[PDB]
Amino acid sequence: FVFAVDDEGKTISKIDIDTEAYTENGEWAIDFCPGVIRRHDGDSAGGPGETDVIYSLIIRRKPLFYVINIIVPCVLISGLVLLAYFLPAQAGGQKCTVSINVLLAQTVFLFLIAQKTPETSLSVPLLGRYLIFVMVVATLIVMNCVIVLNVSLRTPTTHAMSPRLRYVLLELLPQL
Amino acid sequence: GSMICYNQQSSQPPTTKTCSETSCYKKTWRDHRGTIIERGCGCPKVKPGIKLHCCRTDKCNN
Amino acid sequence: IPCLLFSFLTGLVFYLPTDSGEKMTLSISVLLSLTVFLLVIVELIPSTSSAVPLIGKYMLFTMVFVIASIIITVIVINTHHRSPSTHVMPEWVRKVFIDTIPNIMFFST
Amino acid sequence: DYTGHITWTPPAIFKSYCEIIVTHFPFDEQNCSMKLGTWTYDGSVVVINPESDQPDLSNFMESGEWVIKESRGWKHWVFYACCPSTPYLDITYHFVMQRLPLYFIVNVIIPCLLFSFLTGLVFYLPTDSGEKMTLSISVLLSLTVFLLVIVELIPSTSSAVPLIGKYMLFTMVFVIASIIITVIVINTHHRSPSTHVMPEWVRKVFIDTIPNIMFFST
Amino acid sequence: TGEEVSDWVRMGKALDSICFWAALVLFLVGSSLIFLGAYFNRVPQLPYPPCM
Amino acid sequence: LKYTTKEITLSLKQAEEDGRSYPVEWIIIDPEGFTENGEWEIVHRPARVNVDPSVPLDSPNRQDVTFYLIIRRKPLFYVINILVPCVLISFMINLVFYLPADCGEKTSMAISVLLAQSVFLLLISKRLPATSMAIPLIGKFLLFGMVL
Amino acid sequence: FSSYSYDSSEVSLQTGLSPEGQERQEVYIHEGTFIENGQWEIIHKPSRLIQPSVDPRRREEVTFYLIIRRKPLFYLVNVIAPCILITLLAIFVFYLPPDAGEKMGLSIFALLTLTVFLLLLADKVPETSLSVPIIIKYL
Amino acid sequence: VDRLCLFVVTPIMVVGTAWIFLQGAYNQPPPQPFPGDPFSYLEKDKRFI
Numbered sequence: 021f022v023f024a025v026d027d028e029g030k031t032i033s034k035i036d037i038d039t040e041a042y043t044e045n046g047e048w049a050i051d052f053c054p055g056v057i058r059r060h061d062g063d064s065a066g067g068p069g070e071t072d073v074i075y076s077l078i079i080r081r082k083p084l085f086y087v088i089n090i091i092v093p094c095v096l097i098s099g100l101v102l103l104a105y106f107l108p109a110q111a112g113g114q115k116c117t118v119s120i121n122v123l124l125a126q127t128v129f130l131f132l133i134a135q136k137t138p139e140t141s142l143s144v145p146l147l148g149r150y151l152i153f154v155m156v157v158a159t160l161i162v163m164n165c166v167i168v169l170n171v172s173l174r175t176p177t178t179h180a181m182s183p184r185l186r187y188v189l190l191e192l193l194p195q196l
Numbered sequence: 197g198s199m200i201c202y203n204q205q206s207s208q209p210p211t212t213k214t215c216s217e218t219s220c221y222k223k224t225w226r227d228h229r230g231t232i233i234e235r236g237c238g239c240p241k242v243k244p245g246i247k248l249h250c251c252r253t254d255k256c257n258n
Numbered sequence: 259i260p261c262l263l264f265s266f267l268t269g270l271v272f273y274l275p276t277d278s279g280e281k282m283t284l285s286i287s288v289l290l291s292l293t294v295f296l297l298v299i300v301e302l303i304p305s306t307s308s309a310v311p312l313i314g315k316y317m318l319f320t321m322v323f324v325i326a327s328i329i330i331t332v333i334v335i336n337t338h339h340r341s342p343s344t345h346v347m348p349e350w351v352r353k354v355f356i357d358t359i360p361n362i363m364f365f366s367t
Numbered sequence: 368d369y370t371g372h373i374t375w376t377p378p379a380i381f382k383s384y385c386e387i388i389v390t391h392f393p394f395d396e397q398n399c400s401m402k403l404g405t406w407t408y409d410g411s412v413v414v415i416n417p418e419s420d421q422p423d424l425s426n427f428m429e430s431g432e433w434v435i436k437e438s439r440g441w442k443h444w445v446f447y448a449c450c451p452s453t454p455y456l457d458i459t460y461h462f463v464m465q466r467l468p469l470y471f472i473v474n475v476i477i478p479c480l481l482f483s484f485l486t487g488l489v490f491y492l493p494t495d496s497g498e499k500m501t502l503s504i505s506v507l508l509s510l511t512v513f514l515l516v517i518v519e520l521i522p523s524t525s526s527a528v529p530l531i532g533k534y535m536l537f538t539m540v541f542v543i544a545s546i547i548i549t550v551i552v553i554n555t556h557h558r559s560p561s562t563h564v565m566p567e568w569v570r571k572v573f574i575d576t577i578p579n580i581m582f583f584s585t
Numbered sequence: 586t587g588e589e590v591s592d593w594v595r596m597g598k599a600l601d602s603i604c605f606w607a608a609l610v611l612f613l614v615g616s617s618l619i620f621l622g623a624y625f626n627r628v629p630q631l632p633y634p635p636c637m
Numbered sequence: 638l639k640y641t642t643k644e645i646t647l648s649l650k651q652a653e654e655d656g657r658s659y660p661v662e663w664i665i666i667d668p669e670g671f672t673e674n675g676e677w678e679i680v681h682r683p684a685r686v687n688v689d690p691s692v693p694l695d696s697p698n699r700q701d702v703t704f705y706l707i708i709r710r711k712p713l714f715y716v717i718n719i720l721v722p723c724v725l726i727s728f729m730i731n732l733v734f735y736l737p738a739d740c741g742e743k744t745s746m747a748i749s750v751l752l753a754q755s756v757f758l759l760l761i762s763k764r765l766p767a768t769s770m771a772i773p774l775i776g777k778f779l780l781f782g783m784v785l
Numbered sequence: 786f787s788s789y790s791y792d793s794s795e796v797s798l799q800t801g802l803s804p805e806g807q808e809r810q811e812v813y814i815h816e817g818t819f820i821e822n823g824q825w826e827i828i829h830k831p832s833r834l835i836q837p838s839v840d841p842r843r844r845e846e847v848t849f850y851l852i853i854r855r856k857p858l859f860y861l862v863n864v865i866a867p868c869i870l871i872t873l874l875a876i877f878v879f880y881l882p883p884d885a886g887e888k889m890g891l892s893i894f895a896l897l898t899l900t901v902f903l904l905l906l907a908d909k910v911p912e913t914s915l916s917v918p919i920i921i922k923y924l
Numbered sequence: 925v926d927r928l929c930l931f932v933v934t935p936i937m938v939v940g941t942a943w944i945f946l947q948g949a950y951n952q953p954p955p956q957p958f959p960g961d962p963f964s965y966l967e968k969d970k971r972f973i
């Protein structure tokens with residue numbers, strides 16, 4: 021195997037592309053396409069060798085679909101869980117409603133992503149790590165809202181004021 | 197403690213092995229080509245549809 | 259049409275009084291309805307990344323609209339529940355929302 | 368060759384039947400075989416021998432889902448009762464494979480673990496918040512929606528219950544029990560003198576016995 | 586009783602205000618760190634001509 | 638389809654045991670080599686030679702040999718993944734009669750059971766053909782539960 | 786059905802007679818060995834010989850028609866009845882007291898369930914744009 | 925009224941679920957492959973001439 025040559029005699033060591041007639045793939049952009057001729061030793065030492073031509077397509081994904089229909093809605097929905105810190109801690113404040121229904125929507129996004137991600141186990145996809153991250157964060161904020169609602173609704177008849185916790189309150193007030 | 201077992205296939209000339217287990221087994225089944233008989237040691241767990249005959253006497257699987 | 263119907267329900271939370279306690283129920287569950295309908299849209303429309311379609315822009319506009327309504331509703335609920343003792347009323351809020359809002363005065367007090 | 372030696376190396380796509388054991392899924396090990404033989408020629412007219420004891424894996428592309436742990440090839444002579452002179456020969460090549468479980472760990476097990484953790488947080492939420500049922504019911508609804516993912520990702524076999532399937536069922540039963548017990552707690556919290564009378568066993572247990580192991584106004 | 590109720594309410598408010606900043610830092614730093622890996626995953630500058 | 642009854646005659650295979658002939662009236666399954674299907678278990682394997690007189694004698698469809706498979710579904714996957722959760726969620730609607738009318742958000746839980754029951758209907762709808770011979774038993778339970 | 790190559794001056798088509806020696810105009814169905822489609826019922830199954838228009842200076846064909854009615858029982862169980870029930874629940878929100886604080890939590894969750902059924906039908910309806918299905922009108 | 929509806933609705937649902945599920949639990953293939961034919965079509969009941 022040898023490579024073909026152009027009108028100037030230069031060796032064409034790449035995939036040729038008719039630049040006038042080429043339509044780009046809607047998801048994939050070709051960045052490099054080198055070509056290499058490989059020669060290998062035979063299956064028996066001293067016997068006939070083997071040769072092949074390798075072309076490598078270095079293709080970059082255009083992520084616009086995932087940005088528009090997955091990532092931005094997931095980021096904006098996962099940002100709503102921080103709004104529970106401004107709702108009042110009482111009946112009718114809806115503190116837990118926001119935080120747990122954001123997780124329900126995030127589970128719907130898990131169903132959205134399970135249809136597109138590859139099913140290999142050599143590595144974790146970046147989208148998978150982000151979804152697991154925002155779900156862990158939302159779980160922690162559900163826990164923190166539960167704790168805050170527990171603290172705020174302690175009736176004085178059955179719950180004793182801890183003096184050390186009031187002391188650390190008075191420590192944190194001037195620190196900030 | 198030892199045991200003398202047959203271990204030939206089907207209607208081949210008889211052969212003998214030394215089972216260390218306390219039983220020898222005969223296993224019979226039929227596929228599309230005919231009948232296969234397998235002889236050996238122990239009492240193995242067979243799939244449904246296979247005839248099995250286990251016995252505790254020496255030279256007892258044929 | 260479903261996107262339009264979900265969009266029209268987004269601003270109606272601003273007609274819901276705070277004392278009902280169902281303002282965030284409405285907003286968050288409209289968001290849940292949009293999120294579930296995202297499955298329908300993904301199942302129906304092409305999945306292409308060469309350019310953003312008009313449907314994609316409308317879906318994003320609807321979603322950002324719902325997020326903005328949620329954020330502003332949380333601001334409204336926070337303003338409604340301000341304690342008189344801890345939070346003093348600034349004079350500029352009083353001037354801009356009790357004095358310079360003399361447009362529709364079916365209100366009183 | 369001039370000697371008369373023929374070497375023929377055709378390619379093939381082999382689609383082979385393999386007993387799949389899903390007991391330990393996604394941490395399962397499979398042993399799948401390729402039985403090869405002369406279809407119409409028996410051992411008396413054509414003899415087939417393996418080239419090596421093992422399959423050749425020198426040009427094996429790496430699998431992103433399975434790791435081949437073992438591989439071997441065995442020749443079998445099969446004799447029938449009606450024919451004691453003609454063997455039937457086969458060569459069975461088996462491959463012991465181990466699944467890489469990261470995909471199912473990330474996309475199934477971790478959300479189930481998060482829901483299992485979220486199940487118990489409703490018992491630190493006071494009843495006066497008016498949000499106990501919202502939390503529990505939304506956790507249940509999140510699991511119900513996740514059942515779509517689980518059905519789409521986990522195989523639909525009835526040979527055995529997968530270990531991941533047992534975890535899912537355990538979690539779902541857990542949340543259902545949480546909802547039942549939370550309903551009991553809420554029913555207790557609104558008991559009033561106008562409609563109920565406190566039994567002496569409830570007072571003897573919950574107001575003096577249990578509390579001595581813990582702290583509150585009593 | 587009302588004064589002690591207000592004490593618990595104020596404690597909940599302060600704890601909530603602190604955990605807001607903690608959670609905001611967690612969310613922002615985690616999202617930025619996860620997507621900066623996407624930002625730095627560019628096609629390497631190989632010693633070849635472009636494909637087109 | 639190339640020959641009729643006048644050209645060929647179809648029959649079952651005749652095998653021998655102990656010098657006595659029998660027709661093979663079953664699908665042969667090698668018991669040692671057979672791996673059962675993951676969700677179907679075979680109950681009957683008969684074999685018949687069918688001659689129907691309604692079709693004309695010059696038709697290739699006069700004679701046939703039919704091998705039948707009666708197969709029971711192994712319900713373990715559907716019992717574990719779909720049926721037990723559906724029944725347990727549908728039976729939790731009886732808890733709303735214990736919830737007080739003040740903190741017990743009765744109707745939210747009641748409509749959320751309906752939402753989960755619709756999700757299960759969505760799961761079921763992809764796994765069966767849309768035939769009209771009968772309503773599925775799981776479909777019957779789902780409709781009954783949604784009405785309740 | 787038509788001859789791809791030969792025209793009317795070479796190969797002439799006619800409707801093919803059944804085993805009964807009469808001028809048939811029908812698709813033949815053997816009533817003993819035909820298992821009907823579980824989704825479709827065959828109402829009319831005629832057969833015609835179409836001759837083309839006269840040339841001043843298309844070929845003749847034999848057309849077999851199948852007029853088939855759909856049997857909608859599946860869609861009556863999976864779509865219509867849940868929609869009816871959801872509509873009754875949308876009626877009954879107006880009987881809920883305002884002091885209960887549950888009108889949104891009922892009506893908007895009914896809307897959510899309706900979105901779930903839209904997802905249910907997303908993979909069943911035709912995707913053409915000449916008309917709207919009546920079930921989509923109802924939804 | 926809530927207690928009355930508890931005592932009415934729950935037995936109805938229990939009975940309906942049991943009735944629905946005892947059709948599938950007691951649904952079995954027939955012991956013979958052909959209704960009317962007493963032959964089992966098994967290897968062990970092979971019919972000699």
Ligand SMILES: *[C@@H]1O[C@H](CO)[C@@H](O[C@@H]2O[C@H](CO)[C@@H](O[C@@H]3O[C@H](CO[C@H]4O[C@H](CO[C@H]5O[C@H](CO)[C@@H](O)[C@H](O)[C@@H]5O[C@H]5O[C@H](CO)[C@@H](O)[C@H](O)[C@@H]5O)[C@@H](O)[C@H](O[C@H]5O[C@H](CO)[C@@H](O)[C@H](O)[C@@H]5O[C@H]5O[C@H](CO)[C@@H](O)[C@H](O)[C@@H]5O)[C@@H]4O)[C@@H](O)[C@H](O[C@H]4O[C@H](CO)[C@@H](O)[C@H](O)[C@@H]4O[C@H]4O[C@H](CO)[C@@H](O)[C@H](O)[C@@H]4O[C@H]4O[C@H](CO)[C@@H](O)[C@H](O)[C@@H]4O)[C@@H]3O)[C@H](O)[C@H]2NC(C)=O)[C@H](O)[C@H]1NC(C)=O
Pocket residue numbers: 202203204205233234235236237398399400440441442443444445459460461463
């Ligand atoms: C996954 O999966 C897979 C599957 O798929 C699997 O695989 C597996 O594996 C295993 C292993 O591990 C394996 O096993 C193995 O195998 C092999 C083969 O086999 C086959 O073959 C044979 C042979 O044949 C021959 O011979 C005979 C006598 O001997 C005869 O009879 C025949 O006929 C033949 O003959 C021929 O040939 C020859 C040569 O070769 C010549 O000479 C002549 O002339 C002629 O020609 C046979 O035998 C077998 O058979 C059997 O089996 C079957 C089944 O398979 C049946 O059916 C039958 O019946 C039989 O049976 C009996 O036996 C058995 C045993 O074998 C028992 O058990 C029973 O019971 C009865 O008794 C076939 O066909 C083989 O060979 C082997 O063996 C071995 O071992 C045993 C135990 O185990 C013993 O016993 C024996 O003896 C042997 O031993 C030996 O070797 C070893 C190793 O291998 C060692 O260790 C020892 O020590 C010894 O050694 C010695 O000897 C040798 C030889 O001579 C030499 O070399 C040395 O040096 C020394 O001296 C085994 O068995 C299997 O097969 C497989 N399978 C398949 C593939 O399929 C796996 O594993 C899995 N995996 C996991 C689970 O992980």
Ligand SMILES: *[C@@H]1O[C@H](CO)[C@@H](O[C@@H]2O[C@H](CO)[C@@H](O[C@@H]3O[C@H](CO[C@H]4O[C@H](CO)[C@@H](O)[C@H](O[C@H]5O[C@H](CO)[C@@H](O)[C@H](O)[C@@H]5O)[C@@H]4O)[C@@H](O)[C@H](O[C@H]4O[C@H](CO)[C@@H](O)[C@H](O)[C@@H]4O)[C@@H]3O)[C@H](O)[C@H]2NC(C)=O)[C@H](O)[C@H]1NC(C)=O
Pocket residue numbers: 685687688689690703705707954956957958959960961
């Ligand atoms: C699984 O699925 C298979 C089909 O795929 C089922 O097999 C069928 O089983 C039934 C019941 O066992 C069979 O029906 C019987 O057929 C016999 C034989 O008659 C047939 O062959 C004759 C020629 O050999 C032919 O003349 C017959 O045609 C006449 O009869 C039919 C039926 O009455 C009529 O429609 C025609 O117009 C003709 O008049 C026919 O093709 C027959 O003897 C049996 O009679 C029984 O039933 C009648 C009442 O219907 C009764 O009066 C009799 O006394 C007797 O009890 C019966 O009709 C059917 O042929 C099988 N189909 C085949 C072979 O493909 C199998 O049962 C399923 N298994 C399950 C569900 O477990």
